[PDB]
Design a protein around this nucleic acid. Structure first.
Length: 222
RNA sequence: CAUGGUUGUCGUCAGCUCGUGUCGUGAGAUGUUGGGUUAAGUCCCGCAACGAGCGCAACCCUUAUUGUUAGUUGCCAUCAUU
């Protein structure tokens, strides 16, 4: 991967000063007009590193779970997850998604049941007022649990856009000894992450670029 | 004031709990709170929680209009007679 690609994506931009976590001085290059800038050679080296690591994961056959919920990532991450065949989250992370897997699996079964009845069963016995509520239940379940339906087990790696916004899944991975890849920025904590990738939080192009490299990592490990 | 069973009340007010998970040294919190809404934790949206049960509501009775089947011990318009 190049550096001009990163520049075109706008990766080198971070958040304003006053939110600047000092742990990321390891990766801050400078600031421009009052906004800190990320060290791009180090960023490229870390990108290639994480690419190799996640390729090793997909070669060994582990499972991968993506996370992005803000306005700027919840479509590109879905795109690349569907490309790679690995699972994803595009809306609110459910507290207990992994720690309470045995309970969440019941609601996944409920989703499968509603689908198999309405569309594979095609029963239409019960009336309109009830089936409408059922369809809205299906809508919510597809909104939240839609990305982890057939995911057979907990992941062996969790790719995340923003750890501050996704403070829950980070903590769940910590509880479960699950490794984290992260699009860290100039306000987040890297010490909560096993494989850091410096980046910007608010660049659709950047998110698509990095997530495309991860999807390529998986497809080229398999 | 040994008990069962039965019952009154708070109160037909809408609240009380649980499993799993998370947070808290812990007791405990969360869920059950927040924005609206409802007669109602009723419903939705949101959220470190997901859900579920008891309850609410509904399924029940009666009244409120009416189709059909039935027409005596009930009823009398079309008719004649008391």
């Amino acid at each position: 991967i190049s550096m001009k690609q990163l520049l075109e994506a706008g990766v080198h931009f971070g958040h304003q000063t006053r939110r600047w976590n000092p742990k990321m001085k390891k990766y801050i290059f400078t600031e421009r007009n009052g906004i800190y800038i990320i060290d791009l050679q180090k960023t490229v080296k870390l990108v290639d590193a994480a690419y190799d690591y996640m390729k090793n994961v997909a070669e060994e056959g582990g499972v991968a779970l993506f996370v992005g919920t803000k306005k700027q990532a919840q479509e590109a991450i879905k795109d690349e997850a569907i490309r790679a065949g690995q699972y994803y989250v595009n809306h609110r992370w459910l507290g207990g998604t992994l720690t309470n897997w045995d309970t969440i699996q019941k609601r996944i079964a409920r989703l499968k049941k509603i689908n198999a009845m309405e569309e594979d069963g095609t029963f239409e016995v019960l009336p309109k007022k009830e089936v409408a509520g059922l369809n809205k239940e299906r809508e919510r379940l597809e909104k939240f649990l839609g990305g982890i339906a057939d995911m057979p087990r907990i992941p062996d790696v969790m790719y995340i856009v923003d750890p501050r916004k996704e403070r829950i899944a980070v903590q769940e991975a910590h509880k479960l000894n699950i490794p984290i890849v992260a699009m860290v920025d100039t306000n987040c904590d890297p010490d909560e992450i096993d494989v850091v990738i410096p980046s910007n939080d608010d660049a659709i192009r950047a998110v698509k670029l990095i997530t495309a490299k991860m999807a390529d990592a998986f497809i080229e490990g398999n």
